[PDB]
């Protein structure tokens, strides 16, 4: 059988893309993934995880990595969850080698419902299995997580070369907030790398605008 794993990275950052990665390995090659010790890569450094990345690609029969730009994520019709399920399907349906069983990481959502909704969107026959923190349970999923993670980091790295230090891209990162605040201060708008709609942009934009006062509000209150 052809076993597949699928996971995503970059769900909460306000800057940068969301990455969804789907991998396919033959049952006969499953051991290799476990032999590569993918279920312990979280503690690895970016460069060493990139090493694992290349090694993973050598045992895979096929794979699809979808980098969804911040604009698309901010211009979605429904909820972020529906958006995720839709794109997990797109990833799976783009594969050349179709898997028979798909292991999917359900990000804090009803596992069975997620599995069934995803399966119903596939254009090929396969059994979908979704579990919370599936990246620690199934090596095949751990592998997908690594391709998504690395791809996410490479994207952020490329943005750093262009815009400078943007931080991790997460709203709780001071460097990210600082970068966004300064950019907007000098340009009057945010750079084309942020997820429109996110409330972080609104709060930062209001904060920078408050720095300039041309009329007193409290002459009467």
Alpha-carbon span 132 to 183, nearest angstrom: 38
Contact by Cβ (8 Å): 91, 6: yes
Burial 129-156 (b: 16+ CB within 10 A, else e): bbbeebbeebbbbbbbbbbbbbbbbebb
H or E segment to which residue 90 belongs = helix 80-93
Residue whose C-alpha is closest to residue 10's, from 221, 169, 127, 141: 169
Domain boundaries, the chain: 2-161, 162-209
Q: State yes or no: 71 annotated in a binding site.
A: no
Q: State yes or no: 8 annotated in a binding site.
A: yes
Phi-psi map region of 21: left, alpha, beta (phi>0 left; psi -120 to 50 alpha): beta
To one decimal place, what's the resolution in Å?
2.3
Q: State yes or no: 165 annotated in a binding site.
A: no
| 209 three-class SS | helix
Contact by Cβ (8 Å): 101, 1: yes
CB count in 10 Å sphere of residue 93 = 14
Task: Please provide the distance, in angstroms rounded to a whole number, between the alpha carbons at the two ends of the chain.
Answer: 73
Residue whose C-alpha is closest to residue 43's, from 117, 111, 136: 136
Residue whose C-alpha is closest to residue 70's, from 206, 190, 204: 190
| 83 three-class SS | helix
Residue whose C-alpha is closest to residue 166's, from 205, 193, 133: 193
Alpha-carbon span 114 to 136, nearest angstrom: 18
Alpha-carbon span 216 to 187, nearest angstrom: 25
Q: Which CATH number fits domain 162-209: 3.30.420.40, 3.90.550.10, 1.10.10.460, 3.30.70.100?
A: 1.10.10.460
DSSP letters, 132-179, are TTHHHH-HHHHHHHHHHHHHHHHHHHHHHHHH----SS-TT-HHHHHH
* Sheet strands side by side (includes 2-9): 62-68, 18-26, 2-9, 101-105, 127-131
Contact by Cβ (8 Å): 21, 87: no
**Dihedral sign (CA 70, 42, 148, 112):** negative
Q: Same topology for domains 2-161 and 162-209, yes or no?
A: no
Contact by Cβ (8 Å): 180, 186: no
2-161 CATH = 3.30.420.10
Residue whose C-alpha is closest to residue 74's, from 153, 120, 18: 18
**Dihedral sign (CA 133, 103, 140, 76):** negative
Alpha-carbon span 106 to 118, nearest angstrom: 11
Alpha-carbon span 91 to 110, nearest angstrom: 21
Contact by Cβ (8 Å): 29, 37: no
Alpha-carbon span 144 to 7, nearest angstrom: 6
Experimental technique behind these coordinates:
X-ray
Cβ neighbours of residue 210 closer than 8 Å, sequence gap 6 or more? none
């Amino acid at each position: 059988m052809k076993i597949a794993g699928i996971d995503e990275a970059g769900r909460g950052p306000v800057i940068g893309p969301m990455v969804i990665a789907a991998v396919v390995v033959d049952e006969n090659s499953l051991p290799k993934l476990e032999e590569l010790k993918v279920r312990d890569s979280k503690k690895l450094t970016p460069k060493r995880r990139e090493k694992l990345f290349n090694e993973i690609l050598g045992v895979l029969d096929d794979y699809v990595i979808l980098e969804l730009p911040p604009d698309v994520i901010g211009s979605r019709e429904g909820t972020l969850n529906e958006f995720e399920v839709e794109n997990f399907a797109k990833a799976l349906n783009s594969l050349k080698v179709k898997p028979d069983v798909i292991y999917a990481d359900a990000a804090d959502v009803d596992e069975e419902r997620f599995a069934r909704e995803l399966g119903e969107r596939l254009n090929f026959e396969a059994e979908v299995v979704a579990k919370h923190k599936a990246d620690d349970i199934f090596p095949v999923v751990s592998a997908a997580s690594i391709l998504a993670k690395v791809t996410r980091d490479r994207a952020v790295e490329k943005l750093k070369e262009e815009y400078g230090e943007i931080g991790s891209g997460y709203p709780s990162d001071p460097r990210t907030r600082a970068f966004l605040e300064n950019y907007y201060r000098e340009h009057g708008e945010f750079p084309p790398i942020v997820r429109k709609g996110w409330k972080t942009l609104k709060k930062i934009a209001e904060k920078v605008e408050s720095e300039k006062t041309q009329d007193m509000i409290n002459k009467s209150t």
